[PDB]
Amino acid sequence: MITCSAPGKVYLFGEHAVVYGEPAICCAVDIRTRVTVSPADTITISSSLGTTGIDFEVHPYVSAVLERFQDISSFDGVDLRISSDIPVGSGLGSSAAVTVATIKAMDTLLDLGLELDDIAKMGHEVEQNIQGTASPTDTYVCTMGGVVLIPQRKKLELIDCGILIGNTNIFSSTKELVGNVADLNERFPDVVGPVLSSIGKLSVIGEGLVNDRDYVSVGELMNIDQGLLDAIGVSCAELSSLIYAARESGAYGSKITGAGGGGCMVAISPRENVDSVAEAIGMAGGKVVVANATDIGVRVECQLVP
Ligand SMILES: [Cl-]
Ligand SMILES: [Mg+2]
């Protein structure tokens, strides 16, 4: 019985602007997906969704990983179970965490000696196949953990304060939001162009402020980012409500994390304000997950000797 896990993640800065050549800063958080494997003669994949075989409708990311592995090492089958603390449809790197956890669990089952970089790359390839296109960001951060400046792929000082995630419970149509931004940029290139550049710049100045743990300043830049995301059309009233509530209850800052148009926001907060921010996000109608940043990336949690 092998159990491996991988964390979810938030963007401190830079969602929507990476595809335009701009830097970003992401942070792995301690809501994790666990994948447990044990040898069998048959493939079984059990989740909250149910038990299937290789099934690209119900379990696409796992099915892709298992395919990739049989192509480099034969296996009679595997009893594979998935547990996750990352809310479904939440937009916190769900698919990347399960992909990366599964790869590590299969690397372990079959002793293939994959390094982290290899795991991250195979992760990217898997998301690329399922999603049509994908950026290497999610699988890299979920593989490595900690605070990562993207795409330099540089580790930064872990966020030591409180992190709250507020879910609007509105599923974000990502491809649509990405496409609206590209269309808006095409219609108004000399307006939107600088807005996206401005988002990039938050990570240039933000890198240092994260390293000095100046979370007041980090929070202020996060608020600016939220406004810039609002400007390119990826926010909504539900996001805004949760975001302002977090700010009114003592957060350093708050903004969308990820695709926008619903999904989750994030707030960072002094530890003395965590309960008060959580409560305010709930009272504004969001579902709160209290997390902490984690320097722990993909990990073997269990490797039982029979
Ligand atoms: Cl899956
Ligand atoms: Mg992902």
Numbering used by the authors: 1 to 306
List sentences quoted exactly from the publication behind this structure:
Mevalonate kinase is central to the isoprenoid biosynthesis pathway. Mevalonate kinases (MK) catalyse the phosphorylation of mevalonate. Mevalonate kinases belong to the GHMP kinase superfamily, which includes enzymes such as galactokinase, homoserine kinase, MK and phosphomevalonate kinase. The His tag was not resolved in the structure.
As part of this study, the crystal structure of MKvar with mevalonate in the active site was determined to 2 Å resolution and the crystal structure of MKbur was determined to 2.2 Å resolution. The structures of the archaeal MKs MKmaz and MKbur are highly similar and their sequence alignment shows 61.1% identity and an r.m.s.d. of 0.77 Å; however, their thermostability assay and DSF results show a striking 20°C difference. Measuring residual activity after incubation at temperatures ranging from 25 to 80°C for 5 min revealed that the T 50 values were 40°C for MKbur and 62°C for both MKvar and MKmaz. MKbur, as expected from its psychrophilic origin, appears to conserve activity at low temperature and has relatively low thermostability. In MKvar, Thr119 and Ile215 align with Thr104 and Ile196, respectively, in human MK. MKbur has a conserved Ile residue; however, Thr119, which can be found at the N-terminus of the α4 helix in MKvar, is not present in the N-terminal region of α1 in MKbur.
